[PDB]
């Protein structure tokens, strides 16, 4: 079976078990890899330009406005390159999705596997005079694959999908694999207050720590398979431990939950209910007269507001802070302007490999999200006034402006939710005393250590000169593409209406034309984004 | 046992760049990538502005003195070392981030009999965790184009804790620290506790 | 207490007595008066994440 | 499983385990060897000349001072290859090497086992006009590789790692192998005392003795292992019996072990504690006062005086008897002057293959070694006098300058150590009738024979015509690569601290820059000294 | 033992035991103290300068 029998096989598909009460999704995938020849056999750690927008030392003009776009680090480049299906349009076919977010109300993670065969390992042998050259291309039966996981995490992890480098979305298509590096520390640490007048910037401290740098090569965190084209391997099932992520979304502000105040019913259409002057109940403060639906009590608060965007400069910074996840739609946002960015908004740049229909093209989203409603909270529309009384305040004592975080222990608020395709799928849990209570744009984060790691190398293959001179033409150049059979299981709950009228379901983005979604002349395709958190439902 | 020298630009996916090819050289960052991005901006793609899904450590005003009843008193905040600024022992010595000091008699580990002496401790290795509210700003909508001179503030002195932070309490301190603490009995018990 | 394992290549900087302090006030002197050192700690780095 | 199925794994990993009272060290190994086609097939006998700095044939200037140098010898050449994993930079990362040297006090070997595979077997075809010419690499698929092991020690040891000639100490970089061969009896004695003066020199004797010269082919000494791509080896557990050696340094001499002399504690501070004028004691010789803290008896002394240099004139001599392992730091000795070579002082060269930054350079260290104090006797700095007795020697009667030889059944002493990375691990004992009592530079002597020696050949690959002519491009040009995978695990007791205050505790050289040590923006780094014995305890 | 009997022993140690993957630390502290006379038997409430 090592040569001349195909030890892997194909399988891409996803099938639903209705046991009446809950629904099992078992999702297969698989993906044709092409594997090249890694650039140096060497581990290397070096630093990097700040960026494209960076101003260089000593504009002051904008001040410290355009110090953000750094993107500056440092880091080490391992010779390993890493295959993660982190990503929703992985597992999901597009229709297959859309059956997810209509009839379930909640999924979680149970397993995932991974298989890698069958491999197969070819040279590239150039003969001719260089004006009429001739490549061959010939296999290498004896030729190794690396294959290494780590199932204890000793490695930083640099799975998350961000910056997408993942499996692409569309099953015939082959894969390009993304290379395997992480951070060491540096100081970043920019003083933008720096002058008479305190709008100039500067930068204090740059450049990389040595003293205390870790340094992780692969081969001694985890055990390296090593595969000829005959053999296969696979990772072993490994089961998550992570909550239900829900797939509606809620439209329930503080205002919309309670008791609605009484008023009298209208006699004729059309007519508004009038509010009924005299009533009982609670409020804050000391208020009797006027009893509003604005004052009065209610036990919890939903949404908080948040300044933003903060730039939190950090070492390493600057970086963003998040805030709620809400919908700019009540306001006056809308796609095509004005495009308020405020609720924390995600934009999806992606390849042609991704999802974008024209080949070597980039293609941005920006999910608004216009769903979330009643968690808006806009931090430039609020006010605080200091005394709560009968009377409206007074000029003085009532504030506007800031700008302050309301999140306290009243408050309840909703992550992100998932997203399709470019939305991770799980996330790790930092070490902390304190580990953050919900995720900003992972659903699943995992309660113990996330899925191992899967780093794949092609293994040198060595001239009969080694050290000449020099280093110059070393190895013979060499290729590899083997293909990686995966499966996850899922589990949800399955949806039953709770309304009276029809509901509107999931389905394609309202505006756009539906040929985009289906393969061109060409055949290139866009898959369509599904939020999701599709379906309305009751928050209280 | 062991200190974090990790912030949220030390955890992710390094934003992809070209390796240099000669030493001493610098990794040029590459233009046209794909990926996630907060808010509006398409270009530049920037590590600043790449999503994540958690933050690490919070802003606090400091030092908030609260006035309550019996008060004033000191409402600590973040544990963080200062060293990534220009503080130093010998100057300029910033207090900032959570720093204690701790007298002590002879009888507690001092040389000479019936003297004082103090330590201050930094701590100096807490370092990815620093968030000092004065170096901060917010900016009112994320794009393409930097902000306005209008629309970018940067001196509040905000709390920022929230759901996503995470943080790391001060841990043992040795000879002078405590060992134990009594845990209040309120609805709401702290999460984490600050010198216990 | 569960005993650390290296989880990295190259040496680590092991912990110890304050990096400027001279380590003869830190041993008993001709009249017998000495101090103890401060550890930290969290005197080891490790990965968050 | 032959072609298309890989036989061995790759695992480099060092794990421990405590039972609470010793630790269990169980370290793997395996590296990738780049082996090439052997110069000639047959063995050869030759002499060599005397060096590089060794004086023409009547070259009186400096008189005998520059015969030291050569460096003549005589040698068979067998057309073998010895991968021996005898370096200490071979089984310890530097980082858990640092924690075996922190938490234990000493440690032994116990086993060892090795493994050849998997075989990968090419030949050179060069195919074109000349000007362009064309190489190909194309594999034998059946082609031979040689595995000759010799657990019955019939051959010299020459497996030393002196002329480090060893693997590699970085996991993911390839290993070259050096070419075994062993010496055969000559004569180079040389006289320097020949003249009226007494200082001219010359040689009396030169060349091989071919009466009893001894020829051992690797064929007839032990049984080879013919190996195609799809075979693999072992070589089966090998167990040591060795004595443990200790990881900690001494700092007490003869002087610093005893009963201190009984003083006066100061009252004030600083102040300094007078001797007792009048105390009982025994005492050496004749004297009874001054009593005294030098005169005083004690049973063992510490360290012994030796003439160093020696420069033994032998039969192929000159060569150097080694003195006492001990520091010069007491005396003025420092790194960057005056840097006294006296106590027994070894300096490492090494490749960048073996930790050198720079490819193709080359790099030393000279251990002092500076921890190991008390033992220190450096023989120009002594004396004698002929008659103990209260009043002080006069000037007759009374020696300083000799040099000479103070070891006996009194005196105590300490072996070098372990060394890291460069250092040796195990030794073979020679068969006299009295075996040396302790090691110079190998911590570890085997009661038994030591681990068998694994010698590797790539078997010869013939054109059509074999003859021709006059032996001119008989054999078609061929390599191979195969992984070596070993593991040796030790077992060691743990130390507890024996004191109040805090220790040093181990690490990187003082005063060298830690950017060094971890990988650069080539990705080129060294690896660190550990002495070690690096930690202080108590003689007596 | 009331009287011209030690009760107490004197024991200032702290000792690791490993299992291989944990370790178990024993601290034992001993002191002597000096206790003084009370210097009021009675209890007290009383305000202080800020």
Same mark, same amino acid.
């Given at each position: 079976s090592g040569v001349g029998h195909s030890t892997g096989n194909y399988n891409n598909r996803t099938i639903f078990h209705y046991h009446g009460d809950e629904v099992t999704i078992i999702c297969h995938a698989t993906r044709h890899i092409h594997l090249n020849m890694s650039p140096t056999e060497e581990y290397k750690i070096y630093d990097t330009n700040?960026?494209? !927008? &960076? /101003?260089?030392?000593?504009?002051? #003009?904008?001040q410290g406005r355009?110090?953000?776009? @750094?993107?500056y680090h440092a880091k080490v480049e391992t010779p390993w390159y890493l295959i993660n299906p982190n990503s929703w349009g992985i597992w999901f076919n597009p229709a297959d999705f859309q059956q997810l977010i209509t009839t379930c109300t909640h999924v979680t993670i149970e397993t995932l596997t991974q298989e890698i065969d069958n491999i197969v390992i070819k040279t590239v042998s150039k003969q001719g005079s260089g004006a009429e050259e001739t490549t061959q291309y010939n296999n290498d039966l004896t030729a190794l694959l690396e294959v290494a996981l780590d199932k204890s995490n000793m490695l930083p992890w640099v799975a998350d999908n961000m910056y997408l480098?993942?499996?692409?979305?569309?099953?015939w298509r082959p894969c390009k694999l993304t290379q395997f590096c992480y951070h060491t520390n540096f100081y970043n640490t920019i003083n933008l207050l720096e002058g008479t007048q305190q709008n100039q910037w500067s930068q204090i401290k740059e450049g990389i720590?040595? @003293?205390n740098l870790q340094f992780t090569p692969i081969e001694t965190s985890a055990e390296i398979d090593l595969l000829r084209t005959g053999d296969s391997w696979t990772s072993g099932t490994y089961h998550f431990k992570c909550k239900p992520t829900q797939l509606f979304y809620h439209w329930q502000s503080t205002r919309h939950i309670?008791? /609605?105040?009484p008023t009298t019913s209208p006699e004729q259409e059309g007519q508004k209910g009038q509010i009924i002057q005299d009533t009982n109940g609670w409020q804050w403060? @000391? $208020?009797? +007269?006027?009893?509003?639906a604005s004052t009065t009590v209610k036990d919890f608060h939903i949404g908080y507001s948040w300044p933003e965007w903060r730039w939190h400069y950090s070492t390493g910074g600057p970086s963003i802070n998040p805030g709620s996840? &809400?919908?700019?739609?009540?306001?006056?946002? !809308?796609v095509g302007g #004005? $495009?308020?960015?405020?609720?924390?908004s995600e934009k999806a740049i992606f390849d042609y490999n991704h999802?974008?229909? !024209? /080949?070597?093209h980039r293609d941005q989203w920006w999910?608004?999200?216009?769903?979330? #409603?009643?968690?808006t909270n806009w931090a430039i529309k609020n006010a605080h006034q200091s005394e709560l009384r009968n009377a409206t305040a007074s000029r003085e004592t009532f504030w506007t402006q800031d700008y302050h975080n309301?999140?306290?222990?009243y408050t309840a608020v909703d992550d992100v939710g998932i997203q399709y395709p470019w939305g991770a799928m799980w996330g790790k849990q930092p070490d902390t005393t304190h580990k953050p209570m919900m995720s900003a744009h992972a659903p699943f984060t995992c309660q113990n250590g996330p899925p191992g790691q899967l780093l794949v190398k092609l293994a040198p293959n060595y001239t @009969?000169?080694? +050290?000449n001179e020099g280093l110059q033409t070393n190895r013979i150049v060499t290729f590899a593409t083997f293909w990686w059979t995966g499966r996850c299981t899922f589990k949800a709950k399955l949806r039953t209406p709770r309304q009276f009228n029809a509901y509107q379901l999931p389905g394609?983005?309202?505006? #756009?034309?539906?040929?985009? &979604?289906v393969p061109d002349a060409i055949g290139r395709f866009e898959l369509p984004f599904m939020p999701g958190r599709a379906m309305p439902n009751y928050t209280y």
């Open positions: 700040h960026g494209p !927008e &960076f /101003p260089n030392t000593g504009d002051q #003009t904008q355009n110090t953000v776009n @750094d993107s480098n993942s499996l692409g979305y569309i099953p720590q040595y @003293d309670g008791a /609605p105040h403060g @000391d $208020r009797d +007269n006027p009893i509003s996840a &809400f919908s700019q739609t009540p306001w006056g946002s !809308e #004005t $495009r308020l960015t405020q609720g924390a999802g974008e229909a !024209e /080949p070597g999910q608004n999200n216009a769903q979330q #409603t009643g968690q309301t999140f306290g222990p @009969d000169s080694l +050290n394609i983005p309202s505006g #756009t034309n539906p040929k985009k &979604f």
